[PDB]
Structures are given as structure tokens and as C-alpha cells.
Design a protein around this motif. Structure first.
Motif, PDB file in Angstrom:
ATOM      1  N   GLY A 155      -6.597  10.335  10.866  1.00  0.00           N
ATOM      2  CA  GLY A 155      -5.179  10.251  10.589  1.00  0.00           C
ATOM      3  C   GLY A 155      -4.543   8.903  10.839  1.00  0.00           C
ATOM      4  N   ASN A 159     -12.632   7.218   4.257  1.00  0.00           N
ATOM      5  CA  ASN A 159     -12.827   7.583   5.652  1.00  0.00           C
ATOM      6  C   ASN A 159     -14.017   6.845   6.250  1.00  0.00           C
ATOM      7  OD1 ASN A 159     -10.773   9.618   5.368  1.00  0.00           O
ATOM      8  ND2 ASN A 159     -12.339  11.007   4.555  1.00  0.00           N
ATOM      9  N   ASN A 194      -0.455   6.746   8.195  1.00  0.00           N
ATOM     10  CA  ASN A 194      -1.435   7.824   8.190  1.00  0.00           C
ATOM     11  C   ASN A 194      -2.320   7.719   6.947  1.00  0.00           C
ATOM     12  OD1 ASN A 194       0.333   9.139   6.134  1.00  0.00           O
ATOM     13  ND2 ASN A 194       1.634   9.538   7.919  1.00  0.00           N
ATOM     14  N   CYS A 195      -3.161   8.737   6.721  1.00  0.00           N
ATOM     15  CA  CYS A 195      -4.071   8.732   5.576  1.00  0.00           C
ATOM     16  C   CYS A 195      -3.328   8.832   4.248  1.00  0.00           C
ATOM     17  CB  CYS A 195      -5.065   9.894   5.668  1.00  0.00           C
ATOM     18  SG  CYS A 195      -6.246   9.946   7.053  1.00  0.00           S
ATOM     19  N   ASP A 196      -2.148   9.453   4.239  1.00  0.00           N
ATOM     20  CA  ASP A 196      -1.486   9.793   2.984  1.00  0.00           C
ATOM     21  C   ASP A 196      -0.822   8.594   2.315  1.00  0.00           C
ATOM     22  OD1 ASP A 196      -0.840  11.498   0.956  1.00  0.00           O
ATOM     23  OD2 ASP A 196       0.777  12.534   2.020  1.00  0.00           O
ATOM     24  N   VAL A 197      -0.303   7.644   3.097  1.00  0.00           N
ATOM     25  CA  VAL A 197       0.542   6.592   2.534  1.00  0.00           C
ATOM     26  C   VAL A 197      -0.264   5.572   1.728  1.00  0.00           C
ATOM     27  CG1 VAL A 197       2.315   6.960   4.270  1.00  0.00           C
ATOM     28  CG2 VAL A 197       0.516   5.308   4.730  1.00  0.00           C
ATOM     29  N   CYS A 214      -9.090   5.253   6.827  1.00  0.00           N
ATOM     30  CA  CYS A 214      -8.352   6.169   7.684  1.00  0.00           C
ATOM     31  C   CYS A 214      -9.326   6.882   8.607  1.00  0.00           C
ATOM     32  CB  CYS A 214      -7.552   7.189   6.870  1.00  0.00           C
ATOM     33  SG  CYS A 214      -6.308   8.076   7.838  1.00  0.00           S
ATOM     34  N   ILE A 270      -2.825   4.392  -0.935  1.00  0.00           N
ATOM     35  CA  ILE A 270      -3.466   4.893  -2.144  1.00  0.00           C
ATOM     36  C   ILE A 270      -4.864   4.297  -2.235  1.00  0.00           C
ATOM     37  CG2 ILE A 270      -3.161   5.274  -4.613  1.00  0.00           C
ATOM     38  CD1 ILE A 270      -0.249   4.543  -4.304  1.00  0.00           C
ATOM     39  N   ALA A 304      -4.446   5.090   9.453  1.00  0.00           N
ATOM     40  CA  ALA A 304      -4.832   4.125   8.431  1.00  0.00           C
ATOM     41  C   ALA A 304      -4.987   2.752   9.071  1.00  0.00           C
ATOM     42  CB  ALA A 304      -3.800   4.077   7.309  1.00  0.00           C
ATOM     43  N   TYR A 349       0.826  -1.203   0.000  1.00  0.00           N
ATOM     44  CA  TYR A 349       0.000   0.000   0.000  1.00  0.00           C
ATOM     45  C   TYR A 349       0.862   1.254   0.000  1.00  0.00           C
ATOM     46  CZ  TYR A 349      -3.609  -3.324   1.560  1.00  0.00           C
ATOM     47  OH  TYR A 349      -4.464  -4.395   1.680  1.00  0.00           O
ATOM     48  N   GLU A 350       2.007   1.209   0.683  1.00  0.00           N
ATOM     49  CA  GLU A 350       2.932   2.337   0.668  1.00  0.00           C
ATOM     50  C   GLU A 350       3.645   2.455  -0.674  1.00  0.00           C
ATOM     51  OE1 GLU A 350       5.574   1.777   3.920  1.00  0.00           O
ATOM     52  OE2 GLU A 350       4.022   1.971   5.459  1.00  0.00           O
TER      53      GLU A 350
END
Ligand SMILES: *[C@@H]1O[C@H](CO)[C@@H](O[C@@H]2O[C@H](CO)[C@@H](O)[C@H](O)[C@H]2NC(C)=O)[C@H](O)[C@H]1NC(C)=O
Ligand SMILES: *[C@@H]1O[C@H](CO)[C@@H](O[C@@H]2O[C@H](CO)[C@@H](O)[C@H](O)[C@H]2NC(C)=O)[C@H](O)[C@H]1NC(C)=O
Ligand SMILES: *[C@@H]1O[C@H](CO)[C@@H](O[C@@H]2O[C@H](CO)[C@@H](O)[C@H](O)[C@H]2NC(C)=O)[C@H](O)[C@H]1NC(C)=O
Ligand SMILES: *[C@@H]1O[C@H](CO)[C@@H](O)[C@H](O)[C@H]1NC(C)=O
Ligand SMILES: *[C@@H]1O[C@H](CO)[C@@H](O)[C@H](O)[C@H]1NC(C)=O
Ligand SMILES: *[C@@H]1O[C@H](CO)[C@@H](O)[C@H](O)[C@H]1NC(C)=O
Ligand SMILES: *[C@@H]1O[C@H](CO)[C@@H](O)[C@H](O)[C@H]1NC(C)=O
Lengths: 281, 248, 232, 49, 49
Positions: B186, B235, B226-229, B183, B231, B188, A150-151
Motif C-alpha cells: 500500500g 508490486n 498508495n497503490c491506486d494513485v 507499491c 498509473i 507507492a 503520476y497522480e
């Protein structure tokens, strides 16, 4: 008629060769036709950032094979003319049951099942699933948690595309990488050529031509020399059929291994060490 | 409990057998009755063992009929050689007959050796299937039965063995909305088991093989980013089962 | 098969050969006691070129030979091209067509209608090498079956994907068809959705594996000599 | 360094030793070559209610 | 058994030169010396076959 005195050699030679020939189609059927339905390619091509476009069949082709399939079909040198003189001496070549268009359709079905459904296409009905969790549980199938891919989805996607491009360059640039299939064609060609060239052997008789013995000599001594020629040619044919039987056992072992490779690594994820290449599968 | 063990290897928790235990047993007994009817009806089912018997009978009956072959001699009856000839051609006819019969015996022994190698390969495969499916559960796909393997039962047979593979096939399909992670504030959430399913209004986890929705909690999910990593992340408020216990 | 009952399938029979139509002798234009004939091209005849006899389909070949080179040979040293003494251009020699003959029929338990397969040979010459149902295949000509575009599972395999089945046609007859590889199913990939089934079944299948064969042993002198002391 | 961690087999992803990722068996006498750690519990400070 | 199979196959290949195969003698040069070449090549032909 003098071959009839030797009896039932020819019938069992024909039976052994037919038992080889049906076994070849059985090998092709059990390797490729492992799927119930011909799955087709979906129009959505964003495969999680991957690029499957040249292992999937090329739609611009008349016979819609894939690009790497076209490379493998172009790399193998084939006895086309080599087929003339072996045909004229009673040796025939039977066409295979499954033509390469249907092998292309079967591989397209296996690809569409593996890509749009994971490994569930071999058990029951194929069902849609994305690739983040698919390659994540396959990453969970090798002992690392699902969060890593996922990263790093884009990095792994471009890594796989670069590996696909390297395989494309290697199979465009090397015809000698397909050693074993070229070995199969070369072995069959040299076996047929050795079988035809052994008609020229006199086998200790006065000539290797039957008319030279038959048209001039008295009947008893001509029957003796034709018996010598028949003994030599039948020994050659029996040696050829025996070597074809041993090569058929080898090809059966290879086809059973290939069917196991299909059923375990295309239709699943193998836990065997170094069965489907070095590294975790 | 053996069924709870066999389901535990194929991605099924222990409770799912007992929730359909009468139905699973009834389907199993119905399938046993179906294969009784299939073995009573199909007389062409046992192709390979009858082919082994036919191979042995054909090889023996074509070796036996080669005694009448002359192999280019005057006759295959040796007393014709011993009673109507002088010895200088009689030894030639003996040489022809003995060479022909020895060649036929060599051909039969070679055929038996090749077929013995094939039968030994099939017997090694049968012993491997015995040791992997009668003595265990096969984790290898399409080895014992198409689908997820449950058992295999050995049955004796003339010149062979017969397995009754009991399989596991999902049947009734449905589609759901998914996310690789969810997420919450913040954090995941990576599920330890199962895939997130959404029915349109609520989010659930569900095992990959049959339908089993459960409310997404902190017990069935773990957080490492976190939410960003991640893809494709969405929510939802991850409910805490500690929250009713905090109010206790 | 040496049996009064023949089951369903495809069975090899005695083969067929295209016999020569004429005999062609070529001599220089002093010859021997026999005299030459006219040249016949693109047809199955006997040939003779200054003693080099045989049977072959002489062609309209444009092969370029060296002026001393009277003959040619293949890779397996079989004679493929000759210099005709009457016409010094080179004629390529291909001996005539032939092939194995396979009978495609349902079993005599069911019926006695016969379809005949001629392996590897084109239908343009097969029924005069009687017809009334002719299908041309790359694998070979087919006599006694009518081609149907409806694809099914392979009943009796022929070659190059064509399979023959015994169906009512509106009556029972043998019909050939391109094989069906299964159904067609499009799985709509979309990364927003998964698909998980709801209800699961239990099923029982069958696997059959040989384990051993018949044990045999052979006495030497009893088999080969049949209890003759001087043979022993 | 000084921070003992649990790590996956194929990827170096270190996480602090918690009860969510570790299980308990036996006392600290029979096992061989074992070290100290302040084992965290993420659920433990949330219980103050 | 592998070693004994190799030794037994080589030895059985060795002693079949003593087998006359319907010829007058096992040694070829005796047939060359005793008879002239025409029947001698028939005896050697049986030996070689
Ligand atoms: C996936 O890789 C293939 C192979 O490199 C790409 O196909 C090439 O695309 C370029 C640009 O359109 C053409 O010039 C080449 O002729 C194509 N080669 C072949 C063999 O088709 C394809 O574009 C890639 N797909 C993506 C999405 O990157
Ligand atoms: C792990 O290995 C991968 C594979 O080589 C590395 O990805 C490459 O990194 C270099 C250096 O930044 C780039 O030039 C390449 O373009 C990357 N490959 C692709 C396909 O993009 C990666 O950097 C390595 N390290 C980590 C921490 O992942
Ligand atoms: C799963 O499917 C089976 C059938 O394959 C269902 O069993 C049937 O249930 C209906 C209604 O309860 C009965 O009328 C039938 O007699 C049952 N048997 C058969 C053979 O049809 C079963 O109910 C399904 N289970 C779930 C949870 O959907
Ligand atoms: C989704 O599931 C929830 C259960 O929490 C239910 O309340 C809701 O009505 C369901 N929505 C649909 C569209 O089925
Ligand atoms: C999901 O599919 C849509 C439609 O093809 C595409 O636009 C989108 O980028 C995809 N998202 C991911 C995360 O793959
Ligand atoms: C999830 O919440 C963030 C803000 O916390 C927002 O930016 C994002 O758009 C939300 N996701 C979706 C799918 O709307
Ligand atoms: C059969 O012969 C005709 C002409 O003789 C030819 O056009 C046709 O291609 C041949 N069939 C096949 C399958 O090659």
C-alpha cells in the motif's frame, strides 16, 4: 561597355548576392538538420494519453506533412503572377536546397526522437522511454516532485490535447497570426517591385528608355545621358543590395536564434527565464 | 576532483570516474592524439579564419583596383585632365573621378561596417562561449560540444579562437523493464534518483545515463501515495536495510 | 576566378539568353515605310505591334480587353499583353527564357570533367538554347551528369535536393542523386520498458570562431587625388 | 493553520517536517523570525529491536 | 555616444548644403536668378544629386 568603365561593381554585387544565397541554405541546414538519422513513427500511438496525431505527419497526404503544417502553408499568401515582370528584368529567384518534403521528414525525425527518446536523440542513439517518468523528470526539471503527474496523468493529457485543439482552431481561423513570415514575403516582394519600378525613373535624363537616348542623339551627349541613367540605376541596385545585406544580417540573427531554440528546447529543457515562452518550459 | 565536479553536473555520481579512471584518461589521450592527426592532415579545417583573411584581402584588393576605374571620365590619371583640357571640362572630369572614387570608398566602408557587425556578433558569441565553457560548464545543449559538456580549451588562432570541446557520449545499449512507481503493501515508492529497472526476476534502480543497478531500498525511494494513485504501478517487496541492523 | 587552379564545388559563370528566332512586325490592315509580317505564336521571336517593339514569346492568349484598350501592363507596369492590329484578339507577351549558368566540377587537383547547370530552365530547350547526360530538375537543367537512385551525403549542392558527386561508374564520372538525409531508425515505444546504455566514451571535437579582422585606415587626399594640389 | 509544512515550489503538496526532508545547521539564536515544530523521524520508531 | 552620433549625423547632414558639389553656388535661388533655366537645372541637378 560603358558599364565596364565603372569597373568591378557588378562582380562584387554578384558576390554579395551569392554570399546571401548560400547563407540561406546554410541557415536552413543548421536549423533543421540537427539530427543524424531520420527517425520514423512507431505504430503504438498511446503516448501516455496524449494526442500527437496532427503534429505528427498525416499519412493520407500526397506530400506527408502534418495538419498544422498544412494550416501554416495555407495561411501564408505568396507571390506566385508576381514573378513574371521581375524575371524579365534580370532578377531571378533560386530554388532552396531543402524542399519542404525534406523539411517535413526532418521535423518528423525530430518529433520521433523527442517523443520516443526524450532528449537523448541529440547526443547519441535514440532509446525508448515512457512518458510518466519523462514528463515527471521534466516536471522535476522545473522544481516540483515527480509524484504529482503520476497522480494527474489523464488530466494533464487532456489539458495538452485541449491546448493542441486550441492551437489548431487558432491556426485554422487566423491567417494574420503568421505576421513575421508574411512580413518576409511582403518585404521581398516590395523590394523587387521597387527595384523594377525604378527603371521608369528618368534620373534627370531626357528619358528612362535607353533606346530613346541611343538611337537619335549624337554620341557624346547620348553617352552623357546613358551615364546619367547608369548612375541612377546602379545607385538603385547598390541601395537594393545594401538593404538585402542588412536584411540578411537580420535573417542570420533570427536563424541563429531559431537554431538555438531548436538545440535548447526541442533537444532539451531550458532553464532560461522566458526564452521559450512565458512560464516554466 | 575537477572531473568529479564535471561528472556531477551531467547526472553522474563522483565514484564513476575513479572506477574507469585509467580507461577515461587513456581515451582522452587517444582523442588528443586523434585531433593532433586531424589538424595535421586536414588543411581545410580552418575555413572561417582563412575566410576572414580572404575577405579582408579581397576587399582591399578590390578597393585598390578601383583607382584604375575611369567612372565614365576621360582617364583615371589626373595629369591627363590637368594637361590636355581647359578647366571648364576639367572640373567636370574631376567631379566625375572624385564622385566615383568617393562612391567606391563609401561602398568599401559600408562593406567593412556590415562585416564588422557580423564579426562583432561572432566575437560576442566567442566571448560568451569563453565565459561559459572555459570559465564554467555549459548547461545548454549543443552549445559547447555535442552531448554532455565536460570542458573546452581555448587555443589562439590568426584572427580568431579555436575551442577543443570534450564531450560525453553513451555507447553500449541495453533494454530493461520499468515502472513509474513500485507499491509495497500500500505504499507507492517514488525514487529520489534513478528509474526502476527489472531484469526479469529482480527489480533495481539505475541512473538514466549509464547502467548502474542497485537493490530498491527505502534509502533510495520515498513514499507519498498508495497503490491506486500511480498509473502503471507494479508490486515488489521493498527491502529495508534497517532489517540487518535491527538484528545486530 | 582569375586563377589557374579551380577547386571542387559549384561556380557561377557567364549566363545564357535564348535569342529570338524571327522578327515579327504587325501593322493595321496607312502604315509607315516598313511593312508587317505574319504572326508567330508560342516561340521566342522579336515582336512589333504598331511601333511597340521588343522580344517575346507571343502566346495563344484568350485575354478579354475593352475595345479602346490597345495595350496592357503588369503590376510593375511592364507590357504583358497587346492588341494585334491584324487580329484584334489579345496576345499575351512573355519574353524568352534565360538563367544563370553554374559549372559543377571536381577540382583540377583531382580531375577536369565538367558538368554544367542551367538554373531554373527546363531541359526541353537547354542544349540548343551538347548533352549526352541529361537530367531534368525543378531547380534547373543539368548537362553532363547521370542520375543515380542511390542516396548519399551531399557532395556538391545543385538545388531542390539534388546533389552531384564524382564517383567511378563500370570509369570516373559525375553523377547526380537525391540527397540522403541520414539512416532510418525505428524506436519501438512501449511503456513497459526503458533503455539505458551500459558503457560510455569520451570524445573531443573542434569549434572555430572568428574574433576580429584586419584594421585599416584611409587617408583622404592621398587616395582620391594622389597628391595633386589643385585636386585637393 | 497550526501545522507547519514543507511544500514544493510549484504545487501545494504539504508534508510534515521530517529529518528525511530537512537538514540541520546552527542553533536557534542567530537566525531571524523562526518558529517551533515537533520534527518527526519516520525511521525512529522502527529501531525498537 | 548615441546622443553624439545623432547630433553629429544631423549636423554633418546640415553642413553639406554648403558643399557646392561642382556647382557654381550653394544657394539655389542665386543660380535661378543669375542664369536662365536651361543651365540652371544642370547646376541644380548636381546639387540635388
Ligand atoms: C487527436 O486530435 C485530432 C484532431 O482533432 C483527431 O483527428 C480528428 O478525428 C476525428 C474523428 O476521427 C475526425 O473527424 C477529424 O477529421 C480528425 N481531424 C484531423 C485533423 O485529423 C484525432 O482523432 C485525435 N486522436 C485521439 C486519439 O483522440
Ligand atoms: C486545476 O486546473 C485544471 C485545468 O483547468 C482543472 O481541470 C479541469 O477541471 C474542471 C472542473 O472540474 C473540469 O470541468 C475540466 O474538464 C478539467 N480539465 C480537464 C482537461 O479535464 C482542475 O480541476 C484544477 N484543479 C485541480 C485540483 O487539479
Ligand atoms: C567500454 O568500451 C571500451 C572501448 O570503447 C572498452 O575498452 C576496451 O576493452 C577491451 C577489453 O577489456 C580491450 O581489449 C580494449 O583494448 C579496450 N579499448 C578499446 C579502445 O577497445 C571498455 O572495456 C568498455 N568498458 C566496459 C565496462 O564495458
Ligand atoms: C536478475 O538479477 C538477479 C540479481 O539479484 C539475479 O539473481 C537473476 O539471475 C537475474 N535474472 C536474469 C534473468 O538475469
Ligand atoms: C502500455 O502500452 C500498451 C500497448 O500499447 C497499452 O495497452 C497500455 O495501455 C499502456 N499502458 C500505459 C500505462 O500507458
Ligand atoms: C499488485 O498487488 C495487488 C494486490 O495487493 C493486485 O491486485 C495487483 O494485481 C498486483 N499487480 C500486478 C501487476 O499483478
Ligand atoms: C519541362 O517541359 C515539359 C514540356 O515542355 C513539361 O511537361 C515539364 O513539366 C517541364 N518540366 C518541369 C520540371 O516543369
Amino acid at each position: 561597355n560603358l558599364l565596364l568603365q565603372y569597373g568591378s561593381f557588378c562582380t562584387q554585387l554578384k558576390r554579395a548576392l551569392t554570399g546571401i544565397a548560400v547563407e540561406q541554405d546554410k541557415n536552413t541546414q543548421e536549423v533543421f538538420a540537427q539530427v543524424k538519422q531520420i527517425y520514423k513513427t512507431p505504430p503504438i500511438k498511446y503516448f501516455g494519453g496524449f494526442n500527437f496525431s496532427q503534429i505528427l505527419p498525416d499519412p493520407s497526404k500526397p506530400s506527408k506533412r502534418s495538419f498544422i503544417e498544412d494550416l501554416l502553408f495555407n495561411k501564408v499568401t505568396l507571390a506566385d503572377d508576381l514573378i513574371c515582370a521581375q524575371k524579365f528584368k534580370g532578377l531571378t529567384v533560386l530554388p532552396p536546397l531543402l524542399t519542404d518534403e525534406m523539411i517535413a521528414q526532418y521535423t518528423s525525425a525530430l518529433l520521433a526522437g523527442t517523443i520516443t527518446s526524450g532528449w537523448t536523440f541529440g547526443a547519441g542513439a535514440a532509446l525508448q522511454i515512457p512518458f510518466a517518468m519523462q514528463m515527471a523528470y521534466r516536471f522535476n526539471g522545473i522544481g516540483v516532485t515527480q509524484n504529482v503527474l503520476y497522480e494527474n496523468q489523464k488530466l494533464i493529457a487532456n489539458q495538452f490535447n485541449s491546448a493542441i485543439g486550441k492551437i489548431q482552431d487558432s491556426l485554422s481561423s487566423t491567417a494574420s497570426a503568421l505576421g513575421k513570415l508574411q512580413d518576409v514575403v511582403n518585404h521581398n516582394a516590395q523590394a523587387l517591385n521597387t527595384l523594377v519600378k525604378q527603371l521608369s525613373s528618368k534620373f534627370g535624363a531626357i528619358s528612362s528608355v535607353l533606346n530613346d537616348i541611343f538611337s537619335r542623339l549624337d554620341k557624346v551627349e547620348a553617352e552623357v545621358q546613358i551615364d546619367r541613367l547608369i548612375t541612377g540605376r546602379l545607385q538603385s541596385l547598390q541601395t537594393y543590395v545594401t538593404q538585402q545585406l542588412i536584411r540578411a544580417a537580420e535573417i542570420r540573427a533570427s536563424a541563429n536564434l531559431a537554431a538555438t531554440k531548436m538545440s535548447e528546447c526541442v533537444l532539451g529543457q531550458s532553464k532560461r527565464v522566458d526564452f521559450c515562452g512565458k512560464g516554466y518550459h | 576532483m575537477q572531473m568529479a565536479y564535471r561528472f556531477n553536473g551531467i547526472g553522474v555520481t563522483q565514484n564513476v570516474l575513479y572506477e574507469n579512471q585509467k580507461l577515461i584518461a587513456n581515451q582522452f589521450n587517444s582523442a588528443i592524439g586523434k585531433i593532433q592527426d586531424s589538424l595535421s592532415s586536414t588543411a581545410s579545417a580552418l575555413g572561417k579564419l582563412q575566410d576572414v583573411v580572404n575577405h579582408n584581402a579581397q576587399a582591399l584588393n578590390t578597393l585598390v583596383k578601383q583607382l584604375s576605374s575611369k567612372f565614365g571620365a576621360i582617364s583615371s590619371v589626373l595629369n591627363d585632365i590637368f594637361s590636355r583640357l581647359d578647366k571648364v571640362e576639367a572640373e567636370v572630369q574631376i567631379d566625375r573621378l572624385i564622385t566615383g572614387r568617393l562612391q567606391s570608398l563609401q561602398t568599401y566602408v559600408t562593406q567593412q561596417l556590415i562585416r564588422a557587425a557580423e564579426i562583432r556578433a561572432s566575437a560576442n558569441l566567442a566571448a560568451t562561449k569563453m565565459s561559459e565553457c572555459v570559465l564554467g560548464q555549459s548547461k545548454r545543449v549543443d552549445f559547447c560540444g555535442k552531448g554532455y559538456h565536460l570542458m573546452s580549451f581555448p587555443q589562439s588562432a590568426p584572427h580568431g579562437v579555436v575551442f577543443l570541446h570534450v564531450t560525453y557520449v553513451p555507447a553500449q545499449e541495453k533494454n530493461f523493464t520499468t515502472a513509474p512507481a513500485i507499491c509495497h503493501d500500500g505504499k507507492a515508492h517514488f525514487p529520489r534518483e534513478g528509474v526502476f529497472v527489472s531484469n526479469g526476476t529482480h527489480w533495481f534502480v539505475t541512473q538514466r545515463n549509464f547502467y548502474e543497478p542497485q537493490i530498491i531500498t527505502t534509502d533510495n525511494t520515498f513514499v507519498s501515495g498508495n497503490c491506486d494513485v500511480v498509473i502503471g504501478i507494479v508490486n515488489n517487496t521493498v527491502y529495508d536495510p534497517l532489517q540487518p541492523e535491527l538484528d545486530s | 576566378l582569375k586563377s589557374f587552379t579551380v577547386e571542387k564545388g559549384i561556380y557561377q559563370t557567364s549566363n545564357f539568353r535564348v535569342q529570338p528566332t524571327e522578327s515579327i512586325v504587325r501593322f493595321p490592315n496607312v502604315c509607315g515605310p516598313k511593312k508587317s509580317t505574319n504572326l508567330v505564336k508560342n516561340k521566342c521571336v522579336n515582336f512589333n505591334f504598331n511601333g511597340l517593339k521588343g522580344t517575346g514569346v507571343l502566346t495563344e492568349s484568350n485575354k478579354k480587353f475593352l475595345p479602346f484598350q490597345q495595350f496592357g501592363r503588369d503590376i510593375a507596369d511592364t507590357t504583358d499583353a497587346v492588341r494585334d492590329p491584324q487580329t484584334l484578339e489579345i496576345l499575351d507577351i512573355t519574353p524568352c527564357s534565360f538563367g544563370g549558368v553554374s559549372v559543377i566540377t571536381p577540382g583540377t587537383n583531382t580531375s577536369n570533367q565538367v558538368a554544367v547547370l542551367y538554373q531554373g530552365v527546363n531541359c526541353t530547350e537547354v542544349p540548343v538554347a551538347t548533352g549526352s547526360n541529361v537530367f531534368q530538375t525543378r531547380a534547373g537543367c543539368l548537362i553532363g551528369a547521370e542520375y543515380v537512385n542511390n542516396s548519399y551525403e551531399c557532395d556538391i549542392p545543385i538545388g531542390a535536393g539534388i546533389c552531384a558527386s564524382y564517383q567511378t561508374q563500370h570509369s570516373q564520372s559525375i553523377i547526380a542523386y537525391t540527397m540522403s538525409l541520414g539512416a532510418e531508425n525505428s524506436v519501438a515505444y512501449s511503456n513497459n520498458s526503458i533503455a539505458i546504455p551500459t558503457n560510455f566514451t569520451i570524445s573531443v571535437t573542434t569549434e572555430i570562431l572568428p574574433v576580429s579582422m584586419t584594421k585599416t585606415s584611409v587617408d583622404c587626399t592621398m587616395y582620391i587625388c594622389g597628391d595633386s594640389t589643385e585636386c585637393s
